[PDB]
Design a protein around this ligand. Structure first.
Ligand SMILES: OC[C@H]1O[C@@H](O[C@H]2[C@H](O)[C@@H](O)[C@H](O)O[C@@H]2CO)[C@H](O)[C@@H](O)[C@@H]1O
Ligand code: CA
Ligand code: CA
Ligand code: CA
Ligand code: CA
Length: 431
């Protein structure tokens, strides 16, 4: 995409801590949340959930003709319900503006006006605080890393002149087709509007890359998941390469399921939640350690702190069936996938070594708040598949009727997540 000139681009300031020193940074809104319009005027190129057939008769003409616009200082709060102060950032779910309504948001941490911050997580401890108290069943307030390009695509894709400054270049391990710009081009060829999301559609292209989910959670359940892909960084896909939901799920270049560590799923039902060992009713500190051996990742450990207590990660609880692993390791991934009857696509795509190499190349930090139009977040917080009674189906305490976006958007529009005190530093000892 190119950048429009209707609205000036302002990144929202955010402070964080890197190896002992305060960094005055900012966040940027993902391009998918922006207005896409003609370069000549205010006519929408993306209108509801379809592209304008006159402006965008094919992708190349669409790309020529259409621009993504800025988000100015006032737009952050007025349109997206996003606020920041100091080291704290708050995302909102439903924000009713003047003439339209926004649902959720996705933002990236900037290094400067033109480039994302790049995190090299190997042999480091990453931590932050989160308040997930105001996220019901069905919501996901997520903090995660993806193998995006630092500049958002502008060096590799000459029709992307907007770049990281306008939140371009998202990719993740789902190879999502709902991205409006991929590889610097409008993803308008083959576009089908979604049946249940009036702002969304899908195009021919997907946007694939490695993904390290540090925190996917609401007040009822939480997980952390490594997803490795067999391709190098940001990778556009078509066809079978995208590994689309359904028959193609395991046939693409990315591990969609991931090697997931979800305490409730692993048989620790009172560990996290309302009044849990980790109490989702109050702020908590999430510490994640990327442990290496011989320079390669071999373990992703989790520690929690809350009210001055240090809380070790809850171990796998299937006595006699699976060992009491308490972290993501190769053997955990293999053993738990066997017990759950899950295809081990993590190892297929490269496994821990693969992941390691992804982390070595550096990742972008993502914070988002969304609902789930595909699976109603049931994979996180309920039972999935809904009628399944075998090991690994049970995910959280929520009803299998929970999480329909039409329901949660109506019933809990005021839901929010707050992230704060982002920090990276050396791996610390926790007694
Ligand atoms: O894409 C949503 C979410 O999916 C997570 O993977 C699920 C997968 O969606 C489901 O079909 C399978 O049975 O379970 C895995 C693990 O719960 C993926 O793990 C997430 O990171 C992603 O946000
Ligand atoms: Ca032209
Ligand atoms: Ca074509
Ligand atoms: Ca094929
Ligand atoms: Ca299962």
């Amino acid at each position: 995409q190119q950048a429009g000139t209707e609205t000036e681009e302002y990144h929202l300031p955010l402070t964080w801590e890197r190896d002992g020193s305060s960094v005055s940074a900012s966040v940027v809104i993902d391009s998918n949340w922006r207005w896409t319009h003609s370069t000549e005027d205010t006519t929408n190129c993306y209108d509801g959930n379809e592209w304008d057939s006159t402006l965008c008769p094919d992708a190349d003409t669409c790309t020529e003709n259409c621009a993504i616009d800025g988000v100015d200082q006032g737009t952050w709060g007025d349109t997206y319900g996003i606020t920041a102060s100091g080291s704290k950032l708050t995302l909102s779910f439903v924000t009713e503006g003047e003439y339209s309504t926004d649902i959720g948001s996705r933002v990236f941490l900037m290094a400067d006006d033109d480039n994302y911050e790049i995190f090299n997580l190997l042999d480091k401890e990453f931590s932050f605080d989160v308040d997930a108290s105001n996220l019901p069943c069905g919501l996901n307030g997520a903090l995660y890393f993806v193998s995006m390009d630092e500049d958002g695509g502008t060096s590799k894709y000459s029709t992307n002149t907007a770049g990281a400054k306008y939140g371009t270049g998202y990719c993740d391990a789902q190879c999502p087709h709902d991205m409006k710009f991929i590889a610097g081009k409008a993803n308008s060829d083959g576009w089908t509007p979604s049946d249940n999301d009036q702002n969304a559609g899908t195009g021919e292209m997907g946007a694939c890359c490695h993904e390290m989910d540090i925190w996917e959670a609401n007040s009822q359940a939480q997980s952390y998941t490594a997803h490795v892909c067999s391709v190098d960084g940001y990778t556009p896909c078509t066809g079978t390469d995208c590994g689309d939901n359904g028959d193609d799920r395991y046939k693409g270049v990315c591990d969609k399921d991931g090697c997931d560590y979800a305490a409730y799923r692993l048989g620790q039902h009172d560990f996290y939640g309302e009044g849990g060992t980790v109490d989702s009713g109050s702020t908590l500190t999430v510490i994640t350690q990327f442990i290496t051996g011989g320079g390669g990742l071999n373990e992703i450990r989790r520690i929690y702190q809350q009210g001055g207590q240090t809380i070790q990660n809850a171990a796998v609880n299937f006595p006699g069936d699976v060992d009491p692993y308490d972290s993501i390791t190769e053997d955990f991934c293999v053993d738990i996938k066997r017990y759950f009857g899950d295809t081990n696509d993590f190892d297929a795509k490269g496994g821990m070594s693969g992941m390691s190499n992804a982390l070595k190349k550096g990742m972008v930090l993502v914070m988002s708040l969304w609902d789930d139009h595909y699976a109603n977040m049931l994979w996180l917080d309920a039972t999935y598949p809904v009628d399944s009674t075998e090991p690994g189906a049970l995910r959280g305490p929520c009803s299998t009727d929970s999480g329909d976006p039409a329901d949660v958007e109506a019933n809990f529009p005021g839901s929010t997540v707050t992230f704060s005190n982002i920090k990276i530093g050396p791996i610390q000892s926790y007694d």
